[PDB]
Amino acid sequence: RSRKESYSVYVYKVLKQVHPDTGISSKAMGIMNSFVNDIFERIAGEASRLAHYNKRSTITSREIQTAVRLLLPGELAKHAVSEGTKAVTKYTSS
Amino acid sequence: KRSRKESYSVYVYKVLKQVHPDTGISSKAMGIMNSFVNDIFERIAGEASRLAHYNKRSTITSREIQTAVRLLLPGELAKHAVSEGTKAVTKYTSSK
Amino acid sequence: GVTIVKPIVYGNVARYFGKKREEDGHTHQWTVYVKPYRNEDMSAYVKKIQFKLHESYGNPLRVVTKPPYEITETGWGEFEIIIKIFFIDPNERPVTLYHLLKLFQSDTNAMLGKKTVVSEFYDEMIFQDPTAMMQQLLTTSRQLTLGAYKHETEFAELEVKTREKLEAAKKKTSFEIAELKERLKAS
Amino acid sequence: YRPGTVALREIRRYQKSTELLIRKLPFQRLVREIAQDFKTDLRFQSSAVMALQEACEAYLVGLFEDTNLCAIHAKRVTIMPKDIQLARRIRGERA
Amino acid sequence: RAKAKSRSSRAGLQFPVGRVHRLLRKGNYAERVGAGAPVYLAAVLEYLTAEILELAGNAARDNKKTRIIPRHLQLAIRNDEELNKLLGRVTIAQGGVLPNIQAVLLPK
Amino acid sequence: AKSRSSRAGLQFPVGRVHRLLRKGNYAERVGAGAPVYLAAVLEYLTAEILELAGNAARDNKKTRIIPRHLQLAIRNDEELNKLLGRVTIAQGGVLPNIQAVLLPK
Amino acid sequence: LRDNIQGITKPAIRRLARRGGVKRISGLIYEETRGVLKVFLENVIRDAVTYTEHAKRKTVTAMDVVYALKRQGRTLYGFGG
Amino acid sequence: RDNIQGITKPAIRRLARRGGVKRISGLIYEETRGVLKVFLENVIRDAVTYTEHAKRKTVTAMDVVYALKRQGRTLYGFGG
DNA sequence: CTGGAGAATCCCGGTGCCGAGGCCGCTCAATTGGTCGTAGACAGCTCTAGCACCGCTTAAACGCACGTACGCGCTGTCCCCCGCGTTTTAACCGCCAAGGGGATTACTCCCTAGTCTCCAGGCACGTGTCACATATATACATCCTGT
């Protein structure tokens, strides 16, 4: 099937790591689904504009990292950058 | 070996000289006049972009451009902008 | 078993106004300071430095929050200043120093006509068995500036060491130039 | 001069000129000292520092226009630090 | 071939439709731009430029100046009810502000 | 054989997050590790928010994250309140707080 | 560099307040203004430098400041070229 | 029609109670109704522009979410 | 400060409803494998700015001295919102049985748009300068404030 895809399978996979026994209501799961579509578009739009700033025609991981630096308040940005860079580091070795 | 940078100064002086024959415009005021154009261009194009994407469309169109002008410009500002553009599209497709 | 040594210099400079001021009767300007001996950024481990002055001032307890830590002030008499250096880690005991504010020159230095008075002393902050955070902060200290870093007191001796180069080069340059120009114009 | 007569004159005079109100040299060192904590040895285009000043003077003038309305709120003519704080909190800067 | 006619001219605009559409063609604002978007966008862009240049020049004349300074822009975009709205969150460099003195802070 | 997402030690979808990138007219070239980075960041924010909301609800004697506690977790965090400053979580109410002036005694 | 927030003098703040309609200023408001201005400056400067470090440049150009102001909702006209 | 009085004084008092207000002036209900009717008309006007453009007759929740994001007021929970 | 009533909260334990998750079964879409241009990166190299210094000039910041004007505080006065009981309007069913208005979806198809050429005006950057208006000067007009 297809019709309407969403984040629900990843908001519940990531929730089962932080709190193995905690569930999530359909409304709250929908709210998380919506929230991720916010940050995705925000980071990707700032990254597209960043590519446009240094006149690149590609959004690389460097653009995404600089877009993450521009939005997260310090500690949030300092840990999100580490998450992204570790994921990219570990994905290039496989 | 030149480094030429583009700007809107040539057409803001055509429009200004035409809508104020005796009035000039300083270089610093033309910088503001340029930034204003680029800003509104960004706004209208971005809203048309979003408009097209909301309807699952890969192309930003002049219909989306008109709806973005309806969303962006306040009531009168809108009306005049929409009328000006609408009449500019029927003067262009009539092969004048 | 971890011992970290941080070299620092704390002191004061003073400039004589040449006459007693009529507004407040002060005769000297002075700047009291702590700065690092090495070209390193103290702010990586120092939260603030408090300077406690003599009770003649409207507020005796001054505070500074960025290196090179210093306060500029005016006065007419010498007094002891208590400098309390606080570290970023609240678990580390702040350091306490006592500096004798020197404003007047000795007879030997007065006869030499020196334009500034300086008194500064070298010390070493010793952190024994510091916390992990404090150890990391002390080890991760960066360089303060790309330029040179230097010491002033004995001010008369440093000024003489400077002039022993300065006047030599100046006289050489002057005489050589005069000779060149005169020979060239004579021809 | 009756306290408030030479100050209202200055209100009418500084609301009619367009020149910057902060001194340049003192403000440019602040913009370099603030940059200090992000990158050793950063250079600034002259126009970049001028743009920073054009940002900050406008921001402070807007904040002193919103702070005056709060002072007039408590039947005051003096703007008090809690006025800047109320304006800014209602601004969402330090909610 | 035929004498080439521009796109600002056929429509009847001053702002560059070629350059406007051009920023759009390689601006990723969309994926396949049509044949009216740049025309409408340039028309309205330059319409607002004219709308403001009007008020700016009029205020300038009020100041007995023949050259629009950024002041003739702050004063204008804050003098007009809808330009201010459109440019409400926009600071105009070297423009100043309008002399709005609160009534309660006056001589009594 | 192996989802691109799995080859990062993640739970989030590196594969679909690539398609959403290079379909939304952001640029003309999504790199090899642009979606691998964006997916990691998205999963990170989800981890943070989900943990906070989840045991805020479990602080409420609940075993099911409810949007009320989504709002509580977001509004109590100083970093997530800056991020989601202009976002209204529906059916999340507000935060309990009584101005001292109003309070009696 | 050191102690540059003091480069914003009492007259420097009083003139800015006069342009904003303020007639009478208090004693502590000068320090409040310094704090507010310091926070705003630090945020804008940080965001501008984010465009320089990413660009591998050593000089902060005007476009970086313009974009930093735009991200803060402070679109500035006059430095667009 | 004029059904802006459906937002009644008790309702405005409940919205004030939720907002921490612990005492409300008499003329605060005829103010709040003018403040709420301007906010509604603005978000509805934008939701009807996103609905006319899609050539649809019913204002869907997606139109309301898009029009609310246009104002800056971002709401989480209705598919956007 | 204790009393003593009288209302509110506030967890404990109980009892069903129904959403949240459990699984199953195919559809979409992300992976795999491979050829084909090329994004940008990196290695020079031209040449602006940026930076850094130094002098002379003077506006300006600043400290001080002195009243005046404005700011927290008190209290009294009077009304207008709070609390709470009664009258009134809104608003659910049951009772009544389905059309139809309209999103949702495809299959054709013709028109619009990308792609990719080769020209040719027109937009940029010079250069060649002309001149608004900034700075300066003075009387005219308010425009005060102390008598």
Tab-separated table of N, CA and C in Angstrom, chain E residues 42-98:
chain	number	residue	atom	x	y	z
E	42	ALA	N	7.933	39.970	-11.814
E	42	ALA	CA	8.602	41.222	-12.143
E	42	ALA	C	7.618	42.383	-12.153
E	43	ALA	N	6.432	42.169	-12.730
E	43	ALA	CA	5.421	43.218	-12.752
E	43	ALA	C	5.116	43.699	-11.344
E	44	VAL	N	4.845	42.766	-10.428
E	44	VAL	CA	4.501	43.174	-9.066
E	44	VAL	C	5.710	43.740	-8.327
E	45	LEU	N	6.884	43.115	-8.451
E	45	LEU	CA	8.106	43.686	-7.888
E	45	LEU	C	8.224	45.160	-8.231
E	46	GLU	N	8.276	45.458	-9.523
E	46	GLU	CA	8.451	46.831	-9.960
E	46	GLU	C	7.245	47.692	-9.601
E	47	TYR	N	6.058	47.091	-9.495
E	47	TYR	CA	4.915	47.871	-9.039
E	47	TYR	C	5.152	48.395	-7.629
E	48	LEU	N	5.622	47.531	-6.732
E	48	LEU	CA	5.906	47.981	-5.374
E	48	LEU	C	7.054	48.979	-5.369
E	49	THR	N	8.057	48.758	-6.224
E	49	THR	CA	9.144	49.728	-6.331
E	49	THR	C	8.600	51.105	-6.691
E	50	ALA	N	7.691	51.162	-7.664
E	50	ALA	CA	7.072	52.427	-8.040
E	50	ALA	C	6.227	52.986	-6.903
E	51	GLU	N	5.437	52.125	-6.265
E	51	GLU	CA	4.551	52.500	-5.174
E	51	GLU	C	5.345	53.234	-4.108
E	52	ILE	N	6.513	52.701	-3.766
E	52	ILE	CA	7.346	53.315	-2.734
E	52	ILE	C	8.095	54.532	-3.265
E	53	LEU	N	8.855	54.391	-4.359
E	53	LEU	CA	9.546	55.524	-4.968
E	53	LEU	C	8.646	56.753	-4.996
E	54	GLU	N	7.352	56.555	-5.239
E	54	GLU	CA	6.382	57.644	-5.148
E	54	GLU	C	6.416	58.339	-3.786
E	55	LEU	N	6.120	57.595	-2.718
E	55	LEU	CA	6.037	58.187	-1.383
E	55	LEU	C	7.389	58.749	-0.947
E	56	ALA	N	8.462	58.032	-1.270
E	56	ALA	CA	9.810	58.488	-0.946
E	56	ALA	C	10.104	59.833	-1.602
E	57	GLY	N	9.814	59.959	-2.899
E	57	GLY	CA	10.047	61.224	-3.576
E	57	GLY	C	9.173	62.342	-3.043
E	58	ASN	N	7.923	62.022	-2.701
E	58	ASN	CA	7.027	63.049	-2.179
E	58	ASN	C	7.521	63.577	-0.836
E	59	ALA	N	7.920	62.674	0.063
E	59	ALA	CA	8.493	63.119	1.332
E	59	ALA	C	9.785	63.903	1.108
E	60	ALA	N	10.626	63.433	0.183
E	60	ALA	CA	11.836	64.165	-0.178
E	60	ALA	C	11.511	65.603	-0.547
E	61	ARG	N	10.532	65.785	-1.433
E	61	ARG	CA	10.112	67.133	-1.797
E	61	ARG	C	9.628	67.896	-0.574
E	62	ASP	N	8.928	67.212	0.332
E	62	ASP	CA	8.564	67.842	1.596
E	62	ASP	C	9.785	68.374	2.333
E	63	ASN	N	10.937	67.719	2.186
E	63	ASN	CA	12.177	68.176	2.804
E	63	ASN	C	12.966	69.143	1.918
E	64	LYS	N	12.425	69.535	0.768
E	64	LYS	CA	13.113	70.448	-0.144
E	64	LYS	C	14.457	69.866	-0.581
E	65	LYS	N	14.446	68.570	-0.875
E	65	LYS	CA	15.600	67.861	-1.408
E	65	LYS	C	15.208	67.207	-2.725
E	66	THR	N	16.130	67.209	-3.688
E	66	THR	CA	15.874	66.594	-4.981
E	66	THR	C	16.398	65.169	-5.087
E	67	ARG	N	17.155	64.694	-4.101
E	67	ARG	CA	17.701	63.344	-4.107
E	67	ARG	C	17.090	62.543	-2.970
E	68	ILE	N	16.542	61.377	-3.302
E	68	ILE	CA	15.995	60.491	-2.282
E	68	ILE	C	17.145	59.913	-1.466
E	69	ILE	N	17.141	60.191	-0.168
E	69	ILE	CA	18.078	59.574	0.764
E	69	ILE	C	17.339	58.428	1.445
E	70	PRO	N	18.028	57.556	2.181
E	70	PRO	CA	17.300	56.522	2.935
E	70	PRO	C	16.278	57.090	3.907
E	71	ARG	N	16.444	58.341	4.342
E	71	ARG	CA	15.426	58.979	5.173
E	71	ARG	C	14.098	59.074	4.432
E	72	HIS	N	14.150	59.448	3.151
E	72	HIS	CA	12.953	59.556	2.325
E	72	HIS	C	12.322	58.187	2.123
E	73	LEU	N	12.974	57.146	2.631
E	73	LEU	CA	12.447	55.788	2.607
E	73	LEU	C	11.885	55.341	3.945
E	74	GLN	N	12.605	55.564	5.045
E	74	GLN	CA	12.028	55.296	6.358
E	74	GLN	C	10.742	56.089	6.543
E	75	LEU	N	10.813	57.402	6.312
E	75	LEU	CA	9.653	58.265	6.488
E	75	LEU	C	8.473	57.772	5.660
E	76	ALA	N	8.737	57.360	4.420
E	76	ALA	CA	7.674	56.928	3.519
E	76	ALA	C	7.080	55.597	3.954
E	77	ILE	N	7.907	54.553	4.017
E	77	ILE	CA	7.422	53.208	4.301
E	77	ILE	C	6.772	53.158	5.679
E	78	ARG	N	7.052	54.149	6.530
E	78	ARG	CA	6.307	54.264	7.779
E	78	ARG	C	5.128	55.225	7.690
E	79	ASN	N	5.082	56.069	6.656
E	79	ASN	CA	3.988	57.018	6.476
E	79	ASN	C	2.777	56.379	5.813
E	80	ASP	N	2.988	55.369	4.974
E	80	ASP	CA	1.911	54.698	4.259
E	80	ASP	C	1.443	53.494	5.065
E	81	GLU	N	0.124	53.292	5.107
E	81	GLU	CA	-0.445	52.303	6.015
E	81	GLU	C	-0.107	50.874	5.600
E	82	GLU	N	-0.040	50.598	4.299
E	82	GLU	CA	0.183	49.234	3.833
E	82	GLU	C	1.632	48.936	3.475
E	83	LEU	N	2.397	49.934	3.027
E	83	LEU	CA	3.827	49.726	2.833
E	83	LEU	C	4.502	49.388	4.155
E	84	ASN	N	4.111	50.084	5.224
E	84	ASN	CA	4.638	49.769	6.549
E	84	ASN	C	4.355	48.317	6.913
E	85	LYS	N	3.118	47.869	6.692
E	85	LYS	CA	2.768	46.477	6.954
E	85	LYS	C	3.666	45.538	6.156
E	86	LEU	N	3.742	45.764	4.844
E	86	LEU	CA	4.540	44.906	3.978
E	86	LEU	C	6.002	44.934	4.403
E	87	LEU	N	6.500	46.118	4.757
E	87	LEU	CA	7.888	46.273	5.176
E	87	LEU	C	7.969	46.577	6.670
E	88	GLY	N	7.095	45.948	7.457
E	88	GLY	CA	7.069	46.146	8.894
E	88	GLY	C	8.298	45.631	9.613
E	89	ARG	N	8.805	44.487	9.173
E	89	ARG	CA	9.966	43.850	9.795
E	89	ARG	C	11.233	44.113	8.988
E	90	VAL	N	11.320	45.305	8.404
E	90	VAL	CA	12.438	45.692	7.552
E	90	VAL	C	12.991	47.020	8.046
E	91	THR	N	14.296	47.054	8.308
E	91	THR	CA	14.995	48.270	8.699
E	91	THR	C	15.698	48.839	7.473
E	92	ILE	N	15.503	50.131	7.223
E	92	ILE	CA	16.102	50.796	6.071
E	92	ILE	C	17.344	51.536	6.552
E	93	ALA	N	18.502	51.152	6.018
E	93	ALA	CA	19.770	51.717	6.462
E	93	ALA	C	19.800	53.226	6.252
E	94	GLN	N	20.244	53.947	7.283
E	94	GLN	CA	20.386	55.402	7.220
E	94	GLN	C	19.070	56.081	6.854
E	95	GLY	N	17.970	55.548	7.377
E	95	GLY	CA	16.664	56.123	7.121
E	95	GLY	C	16.131	56.950	8.276
E	96	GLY	N	16.459	56.548	9.499
E	96	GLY	CA	15.951	57.225	10.677
E	96	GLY	C	14.633	56.641	11.146
E	97	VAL	N	13.877	57.470	11.863
E	97	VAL	CA	12.549	57.099	12.340
E	97	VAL	C	11.632	58.298	12.146
E	98	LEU	N	10.351	58.158	12.507
E	98	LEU	CA	9.409	59.309	12.405
E	98	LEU	C	9.276	59.987	13.767
